[PDB]
C-alpha cells in the first residue's frame, strides 16, 4: 500500500505562467495562485466532477508579473510581490489592496510572512533584502553581507524559538540571518548554479535549496551544517516539505520529484500526461508547489497557465 499521487484535475483561468501557489490551514477550500497575467486568482475548491475548482476572485493591482503570494495565519489577508518592485497587502474579503510596500528599485522576487505575521521580508533583483512591518514601513534594509546577485527567495522559519530568515540568490549562496539583529548567521556554499528557491521544514530545523545546478541540498538550521544532496536531474523551480510526512517535493523541469527523506529515495515522480503529438516543444515547466493543510493534496503551477491538483492516494501493491 505504498502512497502514490494521481491527477485529480486542473484549475483553469490564468492567462500567464502560474508563478506561485498559496494555501491556508484555515480555509481548506480556498487557494491563491499568482501568475504572469499580473493578477492573483482566489479559487473556490468545489471538488465537483466538472471542475475541481473555479476562479472566485481576482486581485488586480500589479502592473507586472506577480512573483510571490502568501496567505496570513488568520487567512484573511494575502501579501504579494511583483516585477513592478512593490508589495501589496490584499484583503481577501473584498479583493482590494489594503497597503502598498515601496522601496525596492528592481523586481521583487520573493515575499514571506513571519510566523506571527508581525514582520514581512522581501527579496528583489536589486540584490537586497528588506524587512517591513504591516504598515508598509521598511524597518530595515540588509545591504551588508547580502547576496551579490539577485535575491530569488526569502523565507521565515516556522520555529519561533529560532527566529531566522533563510535567503538564496543567484550568487549560488544560502544565507541564514538572525532576525533579532538582522545580521548574517551562516553562509552555506556548495551550489554550482544560481539558486531559485529555499524551503524550511514545518519544525524550522531543515532547509532545502535548489536551482540551476539541479541539486537539492539539505542544510541543518539548528547546527548550520550540510546534510544531504538529492539529484533532481533538472532545474529546480520550487521546493516544498510535506506538512505531515518526511517528504521533499521539487518542481524539477516539467515533472515533480518527491523524496522520502528517511530513505533518500524517490517516492513518486509526477509527470504530466504527455500527448502523443508530433510537436517537439518542451513540455510545460512546473514552477510552483504547495501542500494543502492536511497534506493530502499538492497544487502545482506550470507555464501553460494551469494549476494541476495531485492527490495522495494509497496505492495498493
Amino acid at each position: 500500500m505504498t502512497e502514490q499521487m494521481t491527477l485529480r484535475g486542473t484549475l483553469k483561468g490564468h492567462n500567464g505562467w502560474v508563478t506561485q501557489i498559496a494555501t491556508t490551514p484555515q480555509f481548506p477550500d480556498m487557494i491563491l495562485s499568482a501568475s504572469r497575467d499580473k493578477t492573483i486568482i482566489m479559487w473556490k475548491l468545489t471538488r465537483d466532477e466538472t471542475n475541481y475548482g473555479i476562479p472566485q476572485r481576482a486581485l488586480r493591482g500589479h502592473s507586472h508579473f506577480v512573483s510571490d503570494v502568501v496567505i496570513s495565519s488568520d487567512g484573511q489577508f494575502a501579501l504579494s510581490g511583483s516585477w513592478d518592485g512593490t508589495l501589496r497587502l490584499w484583503d481577501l474579503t473584498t479583493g482590494t489592496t489594503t497597503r502598498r510596500f515601496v522601496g525596492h528599485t528592481k523586481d521583487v522576487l520573493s515575499v514571506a510572512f513571519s510566523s506571527d505575521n508581525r514582520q514581512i521580508v522581501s527579496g528583489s533583483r536589486d540584490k537586497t533584502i528588506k524587512l517591513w512591518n504591516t504598515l508598509g514601513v521598511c524597518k530595515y534594509t540588509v545591504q551588508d553581507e547580502s547576496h551579490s546577485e539577485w535575491v530569488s527567495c526569502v523565507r521565515f522559519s516556522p520555529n519561533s524559538s529560532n527566529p531566522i530568515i533563510v535567503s538564496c540568490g543567484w550568487d549560488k549562496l544560502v544565507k541564514v540571518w538572525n532576525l533579532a539583529n538582522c545580521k548574517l548567521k551562516t553562509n552555506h556554499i556548495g551550489h554550482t548554479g544560481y539558486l531559485n528557491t529555499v524551503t524550511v521544514s514545518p519544525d524550522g530545523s531543515l532547509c532545502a535549496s535548489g536551482g540551476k545546478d539541479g541539486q537539492a541540498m539539505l542544510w541543518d538550521l539548528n547546527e548550520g551544517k550540510h546534510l544531504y544532496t538529492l539529484d533532481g536531474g533538472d532545474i529546480i523551480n520550487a521546493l516544498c516539505f510535506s506538512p505531515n510526512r518526511y517528504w521533499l517535493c521539487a518542481a524539477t523541469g516539467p515533472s515533480i520529484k518527491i523524496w522520502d527523506l528517511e530513505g533518500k529515495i524517490i517516492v513518486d515522480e509526477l509527470k504530466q500526461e504527455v500527448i502523443s503529438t508530433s510537436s517537439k516543444a518542451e513540455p510545460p515547466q512546473c514552477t510552483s508547489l504547495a501542500w494543502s493543510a492536511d497534506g493530502q493534496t499538492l497544487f502545482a503551477g506550470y507555464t501553460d497557465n494551469l494549476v494541476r491538483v495531485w492527490q495522495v492516494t494509497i496505492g495498493t501493491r
Binding site: 553562509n187 556548495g190 551544517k225
Partner: peptide
C-alpha cells in the same frame, strides 16, 4: 566553483 558544501558562521 565549489566542489564540496562548506558553511561558515
Amino acid at each position: 566553483l565549489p566542489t564540496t558544501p562548506i558553511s561558515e558562521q
